[PDB]
């Protein structure tokens, strides 16, 4: 469906003005007829974007109500009402058991539904942001007259007019223009104004001057044009549809959840029906056969687990909110940890998005300035008298000014009225020479010639601030070579000197080096005009050369670039040390893209492209073995004629990849290419041209300050302070939460065994029921909750940023090793500790373990109010039941006591508690509150009715203590083996 939109567009900028009118039945001068425009409206439809059909929240909520655990809990809830129905008909049961348990279980499903619904959130308003880029109104020429109309009423063929400050209402063929410049950052991510004129200037319509696009704005001048595309058919309207239309897809974390749901659901249905038939064979009435099944359901399903996961995710997202990293989708909290490839935009993401002075060439020396936002570098020069001469030209031969009321904000961050290069120079001098306004007050400008297309230079004449002179100084800047052809002397370390071929060659060298760094280079020179030839009232003519512009003194060079953000180089290296592949994907030109790649460490030192090898060896590129080149730089124009299989080979064959001059669909294609190889991919960006890629990414991260509204709609995560170091933190947090989820899951599952085994022995042994159904829910929904959550606050056991990204195909959240430990080893020890306390309670009340076998028949018989114990005493029905429920209560408390040790062992997968310590305060809180809850549930009056919880005698609490301790020792010995031999036996069997 969207495969059409993933392709490069076709256009009609090649046609003549006249020819273009024939195609759209239009007038170049009079414009369309009121009738013809209305006709075309009904024909083509409105100049608007329609949002894609969404899934209502209704269906979204209910889709969770049927996912493995909820299905089993539904079967339980209904099976409760089943047994209740069968009762209400047969023998009038005045009880509330099956009825209430059926109500409780149905509530558990609904509430669990809210948790998973909260986790599976999708806040997407892509198409809405795009719609915000179409103006409310447009100016059209109809019947030879200009009028404002609803922009939706704009059709292909009419004559539209735009001017500085307004949004392009539709894709236009420029037919007339006067000084028109446009901001195409929507399509390129670059905000430098692009001229628009009627002349065709490139075969590529996205590069030609005679096309203006919807989603962009006119920055200055005026233009008229013929509408060629409207609504969804515009270049960026298609990007809108592509972006808004892209299928979301399941996250890595989501896939893991479903996976263990299958496992646990599997064992649940297995043991469920495996013992349902095992009971009927033993001659159990279907009346009972279902009651046992309900218990089996409740025992096997970890009722509180899915909600635990959600809370652990939420708590991890809260910590990241506190580092200026907003998470829109709870699952995106983990994806960053599983990320193996980052596709990053350059401008406004890796870079500050601001022309900044990078180097200066004066005194036959290359000086480097500090490009960082917060200025974390050092000085270059202050002493040289040459510097002050260059500094003066940079301030004086400059027409840029700071906007009013910025004195509060830092120099480099403040808004400037002017072109990017003049702003850069302004901020450079203001920083290291103080107030520039001061320099422009001490040296009043009397005449100037602003930068001309033809002159290729800008000159200014000022009253020298010096009192002993107060004469006229000439300054000029422009193209380095043009400035050179106008110089005779060079200000070396203070004093001038003739411009010999020697210094002239050093100039060329300096010029070539700076240009090689992808930096824009300017020349600077001045000339102190002779006093006798220029009186204090001498008039200077700016129109006609009234003053010399030759034999001037060359002062120096200055170079500039849109520099990396301070934290970016280090963040890139850190991603790469964690084994994450970092690719650059930018709408910017290749020379600039490549230079920043080396600056931030995308391309490491020494690595070459095929073009680099060819130039170094002075040989044809076809003569170069492409396998000798680990780095590559792909232009979008070449990308366009490559198949995906060939794109896949590029991705496979290079470690250091730069995709430059890419369109928005091309970014999507590169992302998909990476994913196709089985990689989890993150995208980082800030422009509307990142929207499709951000949507398709497993996780999209947008910049918060510099980011466009669209990009932040398309993302899963926002960096609110533009701190790229947050990606590094995000991946670290993502890995940590992945491990801690394992700990929390094992902990929760472990207690399933002591809830399953009592029901089994109840059938096979014919003893009184050791633990009840209600009692199970008091564990999974009550006591285990805070402890399970607390594992989310566990510190790393080792340097997680030192390991490679997990293999999502092999490294699962829940594997066989977890089940073996939780179900086969620790849970089994917990089961016994439960049974022990059960036998203790009964034996101390007169029913010794031996006489318990095959007694349930008489025990449950409501009409036998005289059962004989081991000592020959006789018990009524309600009397023995009180002891039985007291057994449920102590078995319950036994679970809590054995979960103490389990909580401590689940703390660490490898390390010892004596190494990791007990610095998790939430965990300790869990221990205290868990025990408080259990005690309250046993001793609070009335709980014997609502939950069948009975007061325990002090000695009862200590039954499971020896089992709780064996767990601690056992797991500590086991992990001691793991560490002592990384070989594999204990490791490959039990290492979560």
């Amino acid at each position: 469906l969207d495969e059409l939109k993933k392709e490069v567009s076709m256009d009609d900028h090649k046609l003549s003005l006249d020819e273009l009118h024939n195609k759209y039945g239009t007038d170049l001068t009079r414009g369309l007829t009121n009738a013809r425009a209305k006709e075309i409206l009904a024909r083509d439809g409105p100049n608007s974007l329609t949002p894609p059909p969404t899934t209502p929240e209704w269906i979204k909520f209910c889709r969770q109500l049927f996912g493995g655990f909820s299905i089993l809990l539904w079967i339980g809830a209904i099976l409760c009402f089943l047994a209740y129905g069968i009762q209400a008909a047969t023998e009038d049961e005045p009880a509330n058991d099956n009825l209430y348990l059926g109500v409780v279980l149905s509530t558990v499903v609904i509430v669990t539904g809210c948790f998973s619904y909260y986790q599976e959130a999708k806040s997407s308003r892509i198409m809405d942001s795009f719609k915000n880029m179409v103006p409310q109104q447009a100016l059209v020429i109809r019947d030879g007259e200009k009028s404002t109309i609803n922009a939706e009423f704009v059709v292909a063929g009419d004559l539209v007019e735009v001017k500085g400050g307004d949004r392009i209402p539709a894709d236009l063929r420029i037919i007339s223009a006067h000084g028109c410049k446009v901001d195409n950052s929507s399509l390129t991510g670059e905000s430098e104004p692009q001229t628009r004129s009627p002349e065709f200037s490139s075969e590529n319509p996205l590069e030609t001057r005679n096309i203006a696009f919807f989603s962009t704005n006119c920055v200055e001048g005026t233009a008229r044009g013929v509408v060629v595309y409207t609504g969804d058919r515009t270049v960026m309207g298609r990007i809108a549809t592509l972006a808004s239309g892209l299928e979301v897809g399941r996250t890595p974390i989501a896939i893991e959840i479903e996976h263990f749901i299958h496992i646990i659901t599997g064992v649940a249905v297995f043991l469920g029906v495996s013992f349902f038939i095992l009971s009927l064979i033993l001659g159990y009435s279907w009346l009972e056969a279902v009651i046992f099944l309900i218990g089996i359901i409740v025992a096997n399903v970890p009722e509180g687990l899915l909600a635990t996961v959600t809370v652990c995710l939420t708590l991890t997202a809260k910590r990241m909110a506190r580092k200026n990293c907003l998470v829109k989708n709870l699952e995106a909290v983990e994806t960053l940890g599983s990320t193996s490839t980052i596709c990053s935009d350059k401008t406004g993401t890796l870079t500050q998005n601001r022309m900044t002075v990078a180097h200066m060439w004066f005194d036959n020396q290359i000086h480097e300035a500090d490009t960082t936002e917060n200025q974390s570098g050092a000085a270059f020069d202050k002493t040289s008298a040459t510097w002050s001469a260059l500094s003066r030209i940079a301030a004086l031969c400059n027409r840029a000014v700071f906007q009013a009321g910025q004195d509060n904000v830092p120099i480099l961050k403040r808004s400037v009225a002017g072109d990017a290069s003049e702003s850069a120079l302004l901020k450079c001098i203001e920083l290291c020479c103080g107030s520039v306004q001061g320099m422009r007050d001490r040296n009043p400008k009397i005449v100037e010639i602003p930068f001309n297309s033809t002159n290729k230079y800008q000159l200014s004449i000022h009253e020298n601030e010096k009192s002993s002179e107060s004469r006229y100084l000439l300054v000029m800047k422009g193209a380095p070579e043009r400035i050179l052809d106008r110089c005779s002397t060079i200000l070396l370390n203070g004093a001038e000197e003739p411009l010999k071929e020697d210094m002239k060659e050093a100039f060329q060298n300096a010029y070539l080096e700076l240009g090689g760094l992808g930096e824009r280079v300017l020349g600077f020179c001045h000339f102190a005009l002779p006093e006798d030839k220029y009186n204090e009232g001498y008039p200077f003519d700016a129109d006609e050369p009234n003053f010399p512009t030759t034999d001037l003194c060359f002062v120096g060079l200055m170079a500039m670039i849109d520099p990396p953000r301070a934290a970016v180089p280090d963040a890139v290296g850190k991603c790469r040390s964690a084994g994450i592949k970092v690719i650059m994907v930018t709408g910017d030109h290749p020379i600039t893209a490549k230079a920043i790649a080396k600056g931030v460490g995308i391309i490491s030192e020494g690595n070459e492209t095929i073009e680099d090898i060819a130039a170094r060896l002075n040989i044809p590129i076809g003569q170069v073995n492409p396998r000798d080149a680990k780095a590559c730089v792909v232009h979008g124009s070449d990308l366009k004629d490559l198949s995906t299989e060939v794109l896949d080979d590029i991705l496979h064959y290079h470690t250091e990849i730069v995709f430059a001059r890419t369109s928005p669909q091309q970014k999507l294609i590169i992302v998909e290419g990476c994913q196709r190889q089985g990689a989890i991919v993150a995208v980082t960006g800030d422009g509307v041209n990142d929207s499709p890629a951000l949507k398709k990414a497993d996780i999209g991260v947008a910049m918060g300050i510099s980011g466009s509204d669209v990009s932040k709609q398309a993302a899963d995560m926002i960096l609110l302070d533009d701190n790229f170091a947050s990606i590094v933190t995000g991946v670290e947090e993502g890995r940590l939460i992945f491990d801690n989820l394992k700990k929390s899951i094992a902990y929760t599952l472990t207690s399933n065994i002591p809830e399953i085994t009592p029901f089994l022995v109840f059938i096979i042994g014919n003893v009184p029921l050791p633990l009840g159904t209600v009692t199970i829910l008091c564990i999974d929904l009550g006591t285990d909750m805070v402890p399970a959550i607390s594992l989310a606050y566990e510190q790393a056991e080792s340097d997680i940023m030192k390991r490679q990204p997990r293999n999502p195909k092999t490294d699962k959240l829940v594997n066989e090793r977890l089940i073996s430990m939780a179900y086969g080893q620790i849970g089994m020890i917990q089961a016994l500790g439960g049974f022990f306390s059960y036998f203790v309670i009964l034996a101390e009340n007169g029913f010794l373990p031996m006489d318990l076998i095959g007694k349930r028949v008489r025990w449950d018989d409501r009409w036998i109010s005289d059962v004989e114990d081991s000592f020959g005493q006789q018990w009524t029905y309600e009397q023995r039941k009180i002891v039985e429920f007291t057994c449920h209560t102590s078995f319950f408390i036994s679970i809590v006591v054995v979960q103490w040790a389990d909580l401590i062992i689940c703390k660490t997968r490898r390390n010892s508690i004596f190494q990791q310590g007990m610095k998790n305060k939430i965990l300790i809180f869990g221990l205290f509150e868990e025990t408080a809850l259990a005690a309250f549930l046993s001793y609070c009056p009335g709980t014997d009715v609502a939950l069948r919880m009975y007061p325990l005698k002090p000695s009862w609490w200590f039954c499971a203590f020896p089992y709780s301790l064996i767990i601690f020792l056992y797991d500590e010995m086991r992990r001691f083996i793991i560490r002592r031999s990384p070989g594999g036996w204990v490791e490959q069997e039990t290492y979560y």
């Binding site: 305060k921 939430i922 300790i924 809180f925 221990l927 205290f928 509150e929 025990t931 408080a932 809850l933 005690a935 309250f936 046993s938 001793y939 609070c940 009056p941 007061p951 325990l952 005698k953 002090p954």
Partner: protein
């Protein structure tokens, strides 16, 4: 005692409940203290 051994079939479940609830409360307070060591 002999025929007056009524105490043999008696248990102070009332005190046990009072003590049990005291303990539960104090464990609840202790937990808050440790948690609130930083929020």
């Amino acid at each position: 005692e002999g025929p007056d051994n009524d105490e043999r079939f008696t248990y102070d479940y009332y005190r046990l409940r009072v003590v049990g609830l005291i303990v539960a409360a104090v464990l609840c307070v202790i937990g808050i203290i440790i948690l609130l060591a930083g929020k």
